[PDB]
């Protein structure tokens with residue numbers, strides 16, 4: 001790359017044509033709507049969980065992605081490594097707003113199912129989710145060639161789904177639900193970063209933290 | 210204002226919650242829709258006309274805004290000083306797009322009316338608007354015998370109005386047309402700059418030039 | 419281009435490695451330095467003069483760049499079309515600061531020399547430059563294959579030179595002077611926009627207006 | 628905080644007056660310079676270590692900062708919780724660059740000292756630092772028998788110190804070393820984010836990851 005690439009003011013001002021929204025704008029768009037089911041992706045949507053994925057990679061498959069298909073990894077990831085996962089502020093704000101609305105709150109994750117899991121407790125605890133709004137996390141798993149989330153959004157009648165991945169947005173689209181994008185943080189170990197806004201979907205401002 | 214204020218990455222990544230759109234997105238939204246009337250504000254929407262307004266302020270009221278109520282100024286402004294106005298590329302793109310659709314093109318200005326005007330010719334020439342799509346500039350306002358921007362949009366069944374000022378957006382909203390915002394350039398002499406998107410309207414990307 | 423290109427937060431936060439400065443920072447870096455000669459480029463540095471260049475193009479060579487070698491154009495451009503040129507705020511601030519310092523102020527322009535010129539008066543007037551700091555504009559002209567400015571920076575012992583063009587910065591470099599970049603506005607008819615910072619030079623923040 | 632705040636192009640193009648640099652620019656500045664001692668702060672400079680700090684706050688002082696004065700926390704933090712810390716790519720690039728130069732690599736941390744520490748191994752492993760360039764982590768501070776970050780930089784003749792906090796920059800400045808700033812990530816639990824560039828120091832581009 002050039003040592004001194006420079007810039008110009010067209011470039012400095014240039015905006016991607018993205019429908020950006022705030023939590024306040026979402027809440028307003030739902031004003032007077034009665035309680036409904038809504039859902040959240042977990043990783044890079046409500047939890048910065050890269051710490052535990054990074055430990056798993058290093059412990060179980062330093063050269064490859066094999067750790068993500070290792071049951072010994074998932075058993076660690078789902079039963080205590082989320083103690084090191086950093087809650088996202090956008091998620092605190094979204095979840096408070098949905099509890100305010102009286103909405104049923106679901107978490108739908110591509111993480112693999114394990115014998116036991118403490119993830120539901122970590123989420124209920126960290127985000128102050130009352131018993132009545134909280135539901136046990138759905139571990140839909142990862143199966144290339146299939147969006148494992150879509151069936152679950154349909155089964156739970158989820159009408160809004162938040163996620164950082166293209167699969168989160170298209171799971172919502174698959175069922176006619178409203179898909180809303182959260183920015184994956186740039187220090188996530190899950191790379192490349194997705195193209196937020198790539199489906200014409202809403203993207204929440206400042207949602208990387 | 211510290212000499213060395215510094216910054217941080219939250220501020221660097223910070224986005225206003227704005228519904229940004231492109232010309233391509235607007236065109237996409239109109240696919241299959243029959244020819245219709247569309248409208249443009251003039252100043253800082255299709256022409257950077259500050260050069261003529263700057264000269265008029267210096268010439269007719271260097272220490273006030275009285276030049277804007279001075280018939281002598283308007284006669285100059287509407288009969289040749291737009292030879293120094295700079296066409297905005299966002300407008301070239303939109304007018305080409307609407308002409309290709311077979312839309313009727315209208316211009317609705319709050320400039321004071323004059324005995325003669327050469328602004329219609331300047332616009333048809335600069336923007337290569339065919340005679341069949343072109344319409345004489347409409348001078349809207351609140352002087353006796355005039356109609357407001359709103360009433361003209363209603364009269365001409367204008368379905369989409371493009372403008373840089375709050376009043377262009379509200380004019381369209383008042384009659385249920387689609388108000389679409391264009392950025393006023395930072396070097397405009399019409400200050401302060403409006404808050405594009407202040408009504409949750411669509412704002413065109415990169416529309417300051 | 420894709421209809422919905424999207425973005426990510428690495429891209430949103432990404433900064434070119436540019437030495438950005440404020441007028442306050444420049445003034446501080448010169449604190450206690452005795453009066454010296456400094457110089458300014460005119461076009462897109464102190465004056466948004468695109469109005470007159472745009473009129474010249476349209477009047478004299480709508481299909482080409484031939485107007486810039488037409489003496490009939492320069493005679494118009496240098497004797498009254500700068501009445502439509504919009505002073506830049508960065509230049510008001512820079513020039514006030516240099517007058518404060520007791521600096522000798524020069525304007526060095528690639529515009530062609532004419533029989534008479536009112537540009538010096540326009541500049542002295544618009545920027546409130548006292549007789550003692552003001553010097554007549556130097557019309558160095560345009561001669562491909564030669565930086566016509568460098569000899570003049572040498573002759574006048576100019577120690578700091580402000581400009582939007584690569585030739586302004588390298589004229590300063592040619593003579594060991596401090597070259598400082600001003601952003602060309604995105605609505606200028608002089609395109610493409612230069613790569614500000616391309617020589618490792620300082621670039622003044624917000625200098626497009 | 629309006630629901631729909633909008634924006635304008637002055638704000639969109641606005642740049643803080645910061646001396647931004649790249650790794651390539653830093654390396655260029657060191658061309659021909661013999662091997663030397665360089666230094667790195669640890670937390671939010673070379674490691675995103677918030678995961679361990681977040682767990683310690685929840686574990687040892689959920690409602691205060693007392694965990695930072697709790698020997699039990701530090702013993703955990705310095706003896707394994709950095710397996711969940713995420714290496715910053717800006718640090719990989721700088722350490723590789725300095726190692727290739729044959730520079731001595733130092734780490735100077737304000738973390739509390741412990742009986743044993745495994746952080747040196749974590750850093751040498753994660754960053755592939757050869758034994759000949761690696762040095763045991765230095766724990767600096769103001770406890771009896773300790774020396775400050777400044778005194779250690781002086782002691783080890785560290786010529787360049789990289790850090791995210793104000794105190795890293797001032798430490799280097801105090802002894803006449805080159806203080807270079809790295810952006811603290813927005814999802815760090817160490818808040819508020821510092822104003823990188825607050826002392827007119829160089830700030831590395833894109834250094835939040």
Ligand SMILES: Nc1ncnc2c1ncn2CCOCP(=O)(O)O
Nearest residue numbers: 043049050053109110111165189190
């Ligand atoms: N490196 C990672 N950091 C955080 N989360 C991760 C990482 N790698 C994989 N994941 C999980 C992504 O979620 C799977 P889903 O999108 O199907 O729910």
Ligand SMILES: Nc1ncnc2c1ncn2CCOCP(=O)(O)O
Nearest residue numbers: 250252262318319320374398399400
């Ligand atoms: N500086 C200016 N002050 C007031 N009006 C101005 C100025 N520059 C241009 N204009 C015209 C704005 O258009 C009026 P409209 O928005 O009613 O069409």
Ligand SMILES: Nc1ncnc2c1ncn2CCOCP(=O)(O)O
Nearest residue numbers: 461467468471527528529583607608
């Ligand atoms: N379109 C233009 N707008 C403003 N200034 C212009 C334009 N075209 C040419 N110029 C003059 C550029 O200055 C020549 P210099 O950089 O040698 O001083």
Ligand SMILES: Nc1ncnc2c1ncn2CCOCP(=O)(O)O
Nearest residue numbers: 668670680736737738792816817818
């Ligand atoms: N949340 C935190 N509060 C205080 N210190 C913290 C926190 N997270 C990480 N750290 C360590 C910062 O390093 C201390 P140093 O800058 O003296 O090396």
Ligand SMILES: [Mg+2]
Nearest residue numbers: 041043044164
């Ligand atoms: Mg995810």
Ligand SMILES: [Mg+2]
Nearest residue numbers: 250252253373
């Ligand atoms: Mg207007």
Ligand SMILES: [Mg+2]
Nearest residue numbers: 459461462582
């Ligand atoms: Mg110039």
Ligand SMILES: [Mg+2]
Nearest residue numbers: 668670671791
């Ligand atoms: Mg630190």
